[PDB]
Amino acid sequence: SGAIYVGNYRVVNRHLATHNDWANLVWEDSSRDLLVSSTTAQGCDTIARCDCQTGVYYCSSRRKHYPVSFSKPSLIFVEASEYYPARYQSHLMLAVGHSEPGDCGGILRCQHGVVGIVSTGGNGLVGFADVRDLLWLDE
Numbered sequence: 756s757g758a759i760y761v762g763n764y765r766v767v768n769r770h771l772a773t774h775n776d777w778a779n780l781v782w783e784d785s786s787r788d789l790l791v792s793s794t795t796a797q798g799c800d801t802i803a804r805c806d807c808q809t810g811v812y813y814c815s816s817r818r819k820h821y822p823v824s825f826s827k828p829s830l831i832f833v834e835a836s837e838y839y840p841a842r843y844q845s846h847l848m849l850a851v852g853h854s855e856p857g858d859c860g861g862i863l864r865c866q867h868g869v870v871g872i873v874s875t876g877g878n879g880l881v882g883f884a885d886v887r888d889l890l891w892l893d894e
């Protein structure tokens with residue numbers, strides 16, 4: 756579990772979105788595992804606007820923050836699941852690190868702010884859904 760609260764928006768993994776999230780829908784992309792819904796209160800999360808490849812993410816399964824090196828956002832193959840058929844997920848960044856299914860939602864940050872959220876993992880790797888290109892989150 757986990758969300759990014761920036762201004763009047765809540766950004767969550769599309770596979771984990773609630774009824775409230777779909778009833779207050781702004782944007783959703785199944786191929787990115789992202790869903791953005793509207794909130795009635797203000798959010799103070801800063802979104803990073805950068806090309807950073809290092810940062811720190813929260814791993815709920817270890818109750819710990821881990822520093823990571825990660826790749827550029829890209830189309831990576833993701834295996835089938837109860838949420839999606841086997842497909843290419845776009846805007847995905849991979850890093851070597853620990854993750855478990857309940858780890859989706861954990862925030863990845865750099866010196867400039869929120870980079871993205873945990874969306875995939877397995878085999879000693881963690882995948883992050885990038886949010887740095889969604890410029891409308893701050894406007």
Ligand SMILES: COc1cccc(Cl)c1CC(=O)N1CCC[C@H](C(N)=O)C1
Binds near residue numbers: 833844874
């Ligand atoms: C079950 O595989 C692992 C293993 C380690 C870590 C993790 Cl987060 C998972 C879960 C995983 O990657 N999923 C399940 C939920 C939807 C994700 C997606 N974005 O398509 C794909």
Ligand SMILES: [Zn+2]
Binds near residue numbers: 870
């Ligand atoms: Zn950065």
